[PDB]
């Protein structure tokens, strides 16, 4: 299957309270492998997966230098953006940045991306061709012109199509025993009577990886979202995920309903039906 490496950065200003909070996290697919947090003790990039722990001091020293450079850029950016929008000094503002790359089943480059947000909305993004920018508004146009003059897209594309995919592949091989594995959902259904005339059916998917999953209820083979209820997919805390979907049905009609589960870990989609 395909894979990705993504880095997520958040920077938050602190009016009257000094330096901004900065948090960086790196992921291979849905598995975190590194972090940096300005509030933490080490002030270094730190490992969060077993397979990255084998990288040597040159890796850790280098990643710490680079993540601190990201932090310094964001500190400048919070001041610059406050200027561009003429915002007061009283308010906290947020910058977010995400970049990374995807590879296909042959582990060859498929796509790359870099997105930047200010106060929770798109500010500037790299286009799919990796050669030009989309600016959200007139202030972001200033940034686009600066970045064109400094040929940012060219060097960012070199990273996204080169270094990013080369290091993703290294990680996939070193972490093979856990990163190139899929955990199919463990599924089951529960039944709870509500009254003499209605009952709840709940379809559960547990212990699955990666996080992407579709749970759908059908009645007589027709998609059913009336009288349905779906929770957001949620982390178990052990590196797997959980989800459930429920429907209220007439008593005696439970067998007209089916729960349909789709997941990369399943050789075919599952259909579940309540059997008393």
């Amino acid at each position: 299957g395909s894979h990705s490496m993504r880095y997520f950065f958040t920077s938050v200003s602190r009016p009257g309270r000094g330096e901004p909070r900065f948090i960086a996290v790196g992921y291979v697919d849905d598995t975190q492998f590194v972090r940096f947090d300005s509030d933490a003790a080490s002030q270094r990039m730190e490992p969060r997966a077993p397979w990255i722990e084998q990288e040597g001091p040159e890796y850790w020293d280098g990643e710490t230098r680079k993540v601190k450079a990201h932090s310094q850029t964001h500190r400048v950016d919070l001041g610059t953006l406050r200027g561009y929008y003429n915002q007061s000094e009283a308010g906290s503002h947020t910058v977010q940045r995400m970049y990374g790359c995807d590879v296909g089943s042959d582990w060859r480059f498929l796509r790359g991306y870099h997105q930047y947000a200010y106060d929770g909305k798109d500010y500037i993004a790299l286009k799919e061709d990796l050669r030009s920018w989309t600016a959200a508004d007139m202030a972001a146009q200033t940034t686009k012109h600066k970045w064109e003059a400094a040929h940012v897209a060219e060097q960012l594309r070199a990273y996204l199509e080169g270094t990013c995919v080369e290091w993703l592949r290294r990680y996939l091989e070193n972490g093979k025993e856990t990163l190139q594995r899929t955990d199919a959902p463990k599924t089951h259904m529960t039944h709870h009577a509500v009254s003499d005339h209605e009952a709840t059916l709940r379809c559960w998917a547990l212990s699955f990886y990666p996080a992407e999953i579709t749970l759908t209820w059908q009645r007589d083979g027709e998609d059913q979202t009336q009288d349905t209820e779906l929770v957001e997919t949620r982390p178990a805390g052990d590196g797997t995920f959980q989800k459930w979907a429920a429907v209220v049905v007439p008593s005696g009609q439970e067998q007209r309903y089916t729960c349909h589960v789709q997941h990369e870990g399943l050789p075919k989609p599952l259909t579940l039906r309540w059997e008393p």
Binding site: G26, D77, Y159
Partner: peptide, 9 residues
């Protein structure tokens, strides 16, 4: 591995 070249906005 991180990008080495972020540029101020």
């Amino acid at each position: 591995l991180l990008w080495n070249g972020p540029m101020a906005v």
